[PDB]
Design a protein around this motif. Structure first.
Motif, PDB file in Angstrom:
ATOM      1  N   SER A  60      51.745  10.049   0.530  1.00  0.00           N
ATOM      2  CA  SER A  60      51.933   9.110   1.640  1.00  0.00           C
ATOM      3  C   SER A  60      50.698   8.739   2.457  1.00  0.00           C
ATOM      4  O   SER A  60      50.823   7.946   3.437  1.00  0.00           O
ATOM      5  N   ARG A  61      49.559   9.262   2.124  1.00  0.00           N
ATOM      6  CA  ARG A  61      48.324   8.840   2.868  1.00  0.00           C
ATOM      7  C   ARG A  61      47.925   7.505   2.355  1.00  0.00           C
ATOM      8  O   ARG A  61      47.419   6.670   3.092  1.00  0.00           O
ATOM      9  N   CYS A  64      52.843   5.151  -0.173  1.00  0.00           N
ATOM     10  CA  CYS A  64      54.193   4.726   0.357  1.00  0.00           C
ATOM     11  C   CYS A  64      54.266   5.021   1.826  1.00  0.00           C
ATOM     12  O   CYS A  64      53.439   5.755   2.336  1.00  0.00           O
ATOM     13  N   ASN A  65      55.275   4.474   2.495  1.00  0.00           N
ATOM     14  CA  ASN A  65      55.464   4.689   3.947  1.00  0.00           C
ATOM     15  C   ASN A  65      56.502   5.766   4.231  1.00  0.00           C
ATOM     16  O   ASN A  65      57.589   5.596   3.756  1.00  0.00           O
ATOM     17  N   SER A  72      47.824   5.874   7.730  1.00  0.00           N
ATOM     18  CA  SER A  72      47.878   5.853   6.321  1.00  0.00           C
ATOM     19  C   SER A  72      48.121   4.411   5.805  1.00  0.00           C
ATOM     20  O   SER A  72      48.415   3.493   6.589  1.00  0.00           O
ATOM     21  N   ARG A  73      48.002   4.214   4.499  1.00  0.00           N
ATOM     22  CA  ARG A  73      48.265   2.948   3.940  1.00  0.00           C
ATOM     23  C   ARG A  73      49.596   3.112   3.163  1.00  0.00           C
ATOM     24  O   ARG A  73      50.209   4.280   3.016  1.00  0.00           O
ATOM     25  N   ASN A  74      50.043   2.012   2.705  1.00  0.00           N
ATOM     26  CA  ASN A  74      51.262   1.859   1.948  1.00  0.00           C
ATOM     27  C   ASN A  74      50.937   0.816   0.819  1.00  0.00           C
ATOM     28  O   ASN A  74      51.501  -0.220   0.755  1.00  0.00           O
TER      29      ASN A  74
HETATM   30 NA    NA Z   1      51.553   5.817   4.158  1.00  0.00          NA
END
Ligand code: NA
Length: 129
Positions: A60-61, A64-65, A72-74
């Motif tokens: 999740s970093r 994905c959310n 973090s990114r998604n």
């Molecule tokens: Na994320």
């Protein structure tokens, strides 16, 4: 859902992983075995506060959310909970983005330390593929 070994390969072959970016199907089965034990509901928290989700332990970093990984990114544009489905589609689609990011399958630490360089065809032996 906890997949059987051959059942998993069928699922992966049908979703286009065999030889995706040149990794034979056995590499993907081996990475799922050692990341999740083939369990689609595997989660693991990390020291940075991130969590890894599903059969391939996607983090999740970046990917994905989960609503609790600050900054973090998604990059796969999905809630991390989709990675826990009995249907592997979302996992596979995100996996294909990850392996295409430049480091190949080395992005999966179990793969690098338990599969890379080993007889990974053994993971699809016996299966009707
Ligand atoms: Na994320």
């Amino acid at each position: 859902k906890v997949f059987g070994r051959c059942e998993l390969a069928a699922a992966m072959k049908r979703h286009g992983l065999d030889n995706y970016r040149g990794y034979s199907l056995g590499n993907w089965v081996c990475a799922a075995k050692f990341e999740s034990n083939f369990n689609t509901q595997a989660t693991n928290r990390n020291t940075d506060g991130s969590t890894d989700y599903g059969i391939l332990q996607i983090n999740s970093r970046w990917w994905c959310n989960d609503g609790r990984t600050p900054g973090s990114r998604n990059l796969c544009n999905i809630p991390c909970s989709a990675l826990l489905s009995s249907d592997i589609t979302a996992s596979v689609n995100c996996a294909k983005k990850i392996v295409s990011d430049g480091n190949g399958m080395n992005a999966w630490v179990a793969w690098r330390n338990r599969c890379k360089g080993t007889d990974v065809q053994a993971w699809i032996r016996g299966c009707r593929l």
